[PDB]
């Protein structure tokens, strides 16, 4: 797929992703905080359409992600992220997608997710996260 | 004066300041690097005009500030930053302003200046710097 | 289990752990680097004995861990860490223990593991890692 790398910021205010209950995660976009101002990240889109969009609007500064989890599995011959769940100190968003495959999770005891990088073809191939205090 | 706080970025690409050889530092604007791309900061301006503009363009990524020094003193009854000097690993830019009063200096052995905050009225009242690895 | 928290250091020089091919990880002791000198951490021991000891000696400050992976699963009614594997920029150490249950992994693109915390009863219950630049 096509790789993207948003870089690092001050925090996260909103996450806009899309999924298909039959396949995997599709589109992925993030509105970060850049020193008090919303920073509209580029919309990393899937090569195909047919996805259900979801908007995760966090109550930035008080609300922040404490755990990211999901499932990775095989879809049409490709290993992709099929499901994603975001847990904050206030609510649990998701699971979005298909909860099938091998689960993974990144709990954070101290620190913040301040950016994302990864790749998207038909679906979200993989991703990484920038962490900071 | 009016307080300002740029916040933290990825690095510094250019610094635009103004001064008067008889008073102190006036305007201050920074062009930061934000994840490999230029980010034009707000131009923090003096309540008055008639200053001499100076542009400090760094050979970002290879050139970076290693020491910031200057002088603080009284101008018309106000304690302000009268002079500023930026020393990088390649050259010394400065002194701009009046080298009179009490000196201050911040040499850096490891780390980078990634942001500025302070206040400016008729002149630059005070300032602080964000430091990071 | 009994909780432990080594805190953060400058790096990792050696890891001493024990395991039983039929259960899980039992003991855990790290020799950290503390500003260029070795610092022998507490040996966090299991409530029981009968484990096989393993010593992982790294060529500290050229060799460092890039990924930690393993398996968590039930043993006698408890979820514990059954296996651990340490991948450095030079070699792969492991898997130590039983590769059964749910796999997990923490790959690091940038940064270093500089400390561990967790809990050990009959076996390693869980663990977390301190990360830094």
């Amino acid at each position: 797929g096509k790789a993207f790398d948003d870089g690092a910021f001050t925090g996260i205010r909103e996450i806009n992703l899309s999924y298909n209950k039959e396949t995997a995660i599709g589109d992925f976009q993030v509105v970060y905080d850049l020193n008090g101002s919303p920073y509209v990240g580029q919309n990393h889109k899937s090569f195909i359409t047919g996805f259900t969009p979801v908007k995760i609007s966090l109550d930035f500064p008080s609300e922040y992600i404490m755990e990211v989890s999901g499932y990775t599995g095989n879809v049409s011959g490709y290993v992709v992220v099929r499901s994603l769940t975001f847990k904050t100190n206030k609510k649990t968003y998701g699971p979005y997608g298909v909860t099938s495959g091998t689960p993974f999770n990144l709990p954070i005891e101290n620190g913040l997710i301040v950016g994302f990088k990864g790749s998207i073809g038909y679906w979200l191939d993989y991703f990484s996260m920038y962490l900071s205090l | 004066g009016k307080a300002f706080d740029d916040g933290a970025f990825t690095g510094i690409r250019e610094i635009n300041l103004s001064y008067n050889k008889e008073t102190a530092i006036g305007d201050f604007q920074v062009v930061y690097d934000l994840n490999g791309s230029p980010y034009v900061g707000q131009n923090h301006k003096s309540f008055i005009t008639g200053f001499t503009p100076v542009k400090i363009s760094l050979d970002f990524p290879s050139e970076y500030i290693m020491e910031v020094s200057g002088y603080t003193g009284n101008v018309s009854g106000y304690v302000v930053v009268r002079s500023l000097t930026f020393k990088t690993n390649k050259k010394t830019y400065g002194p701009y302003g009046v080298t009179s009063g009490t000196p201050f200096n911040l040499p850096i052995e490891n780390g980078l200046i990634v942001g500025f905050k302070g206040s400016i009225g008729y002149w630059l009242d005070y300032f602080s710097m964000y430091l990071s690895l | 289990g009994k909780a432990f928290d080594d805190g953060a250091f400058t790096g990792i020089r050696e890891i001493n752990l024990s395991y039983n091919k039929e259960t899980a990880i039992g003991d855990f002791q790290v020799v950290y680097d503390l500003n260029g000198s070795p610092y022998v951490g507490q040996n966090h021991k299991s409530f029981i004995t009968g484990f096989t000891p393993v010593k992982i000696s790294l060529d500290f400050p050229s060799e460092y861990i890039m990924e930690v992976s393993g398996y968590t699963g039930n043993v006698s009614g408890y979820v514990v860490v059954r296996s651990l594997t340490f991948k450095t920029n030079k070699k792969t150490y492991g898997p130590y223990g039983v590769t059964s249950g749910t796999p997990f992994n923490l790959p690091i693109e940038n940064g270093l593991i500089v400390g561990f915390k967790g809990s050990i009863g009959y076996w390693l219950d869980y663990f977390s890692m301190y990360l830094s630049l």
Partner: peptide
């Protein structure tokens, strides 16, 4: 050498 760094963990998904 002049660019600030940040801790980065991952990839999860396709190897």
């Amino acid at each position: 050498s002049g660019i600030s760094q940040t801790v980065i963990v991952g990839p999860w998904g396709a190897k």
